[PDB]
Amino acid sequence: YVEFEPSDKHIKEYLNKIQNSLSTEWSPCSVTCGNGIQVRIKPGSANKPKDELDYANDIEKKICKMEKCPH
Ligand SMILES: [Pt+2]
Q1: Lipid (GPI-anchor amidated cysteine) linked to which residue positions?
Q2: How remote is the CA of residue 71 from the centroid of ligand 1, in Å?
Q3: Among 27, 35, 38, 68, which is most exposed with the fewest C-beta within 10 angstroms?
Q4: C-alpha distances in Å from residue 18, one per residue of 14, 26, 39, 40
Q5: Integer CA distances (angstroms), 49 to 5, 30, 33, 44, 63, in order
Q6: Domain 1-71: which CATH class?
Protein backbone atom coordinates (compact mmCIF):
# COMPACT_ATOMS: atom_id res chain seq x y z
CA TYR A 1 0.00 0.00 0.00
CA VAL A 2 1.08 3.61 -0.58
CA GLU A 3 2.92 4.87 2.50
CA PHE A 4 2.02 8.57 2.35
CA GLU A 5 5.13 9.29 4.43
CA PRO A 6 8.30 11.05 3.38
CA SER A 7 11.03 8.63 2.28
CA ASP A 8 14.62 8.61 3.54
CA LYS A 9 15.93 8.78 -0.02
CA HIS A 10 13.99 11.99 -0.60
CA ILE A 11 15.01 13.54 2.72
CA LYS A 12 18.64 12.82 1.83
CA GLU A 13 18.08 14.59 -1.49
CA TYR A 14 16.79 17.62 0.44
CA LEU A 15 19.88 17.49 2.66
CA ASN A 16 22.02 17.82 -0.47
CA LYS A 17 19.94 20.77 -1.67
CA ILE A 18 20.07 22.85 1.52
CA GLN A 19 23.50 21.73 2.78
CA ASN A 20 25.00 25.24 2.78
CA SER A 21 22.29 26.54 5.12
CA LEU A 22 21.95 23.38 7.22
CA SER A 23 22.29 24.26 10.90
CA THR A 24 20.89 23.47 14.35
CA GLU A 25 17.89 25.62 13.41
CA TRP A 26 15.10 23.96 11.43
CA SER A 27 15.48 24.30 7.66
CA PRO A 28 12.78 25.86 5.49
CA CYS A 29 10.02 23.44 4.52
CA SER A 30 11.11 21.44 1.46
CA VAL A 31 7.85 22.35 -0.39
CA THR A 32 5.81 25.51 -0.95
CA CYS A 33 2.54 23.57 -1.06
CA GLY A 34 1.39 20.18 0.25
CA ASN A 35 3.50 17.98 2.52
CA GLY A 36 7.28 18.22 2.84
CA ILE A 37 10.09 17.95 5.37
CA GLN A 38 12.18 20.19 7.59
CA VAL A 39 15.57 19.03 8.79
CA ARG A 40 18.28 20.16 11.17
CA ILE A 41 21.47 19.03 12.82
CA LYS A 42 20.83 17.65 16.28
CA PRO A 43 22.14 20.16 18.86
CA GLY A 44 24.47 17.55 20.39
CA SER A 45 26.07 17.05 16.98
CA ALA A 46 26.86 20.71 16.26
CA ASN A 47 30.60 20.04 16.67
CA LYS A 48 30.76 17.37 13.95
CA PRO A 49 32.31 18.03 10.56
CA LYS A 50 29.99 17.92 7.57
CA ASP A 51 31.48 14.59 6.47
CA GLU A 52 30.67 12.74 9.70
CA LEU A 53 26.94 13.38 10.06
CA ASP A 54 25.04 10.13 10.56
CA TYR A 55 21.60 10.35 8.92
CA ALA A 56 19.74 8.45 11.64
CA ASN A 57 21.47 9.88 14.72
CA ASP A 58 22.79 13.33 13.81
CA ILE A 59 19.96 14.71 11.64
CA GLU A 60 16.49 15.53 12.97
CA LYS A 61 13.46 15.52 10.65
CA LYS A 62 9.87 16.71 10.90
CA ILE A 63 6.98 16.82 8.49
CA CYS A 64 5.85 20.27 7.41
CA LYS A 65 2.49 20.99 5.80
CA MET A 66 1.92 23.99 3.55
CA GLU A 67 -1.29 25.09 1.86
CA LYS A 68 -2.92 22.84 -0.76
CA CYS A 69 -1.16 22.76 -4.13
CA PRO A 70 -2.97 24.79 -6.80
CA HIS A 71 -4.00 23.70 -10.30
PT1 LIG B 1 3.67 26.50 5.25
Answers
A1: 69
A2: 18
A3: 68
A4: 6, 11, 9, 10
A5: 29, 23, 32, 13, 25
A6: mainly beta
With contact defined as beta carbons under 8 Å apart, do 17 and 39 qualify?
no
**Rounded distance from Cα 37 to ligand 1 centre (Å):** 11
Compute the distance from residue 17 Cα to the ligand 1 centre, in Å.
19
Specified resolution (Å): 1.8
Experiment used for this model? X-ray
Taking CA atoms, 5 is separated from 8, 9, 10, 12, 36, in Å, by: 10, 12, 11, 14, 9
Domain residue limits, the chain: 1-71
Residue 39, number of CB atoms within 10 A of its CB = 20
Distance in Å, CA 49 to ligand 1 centroid? 30
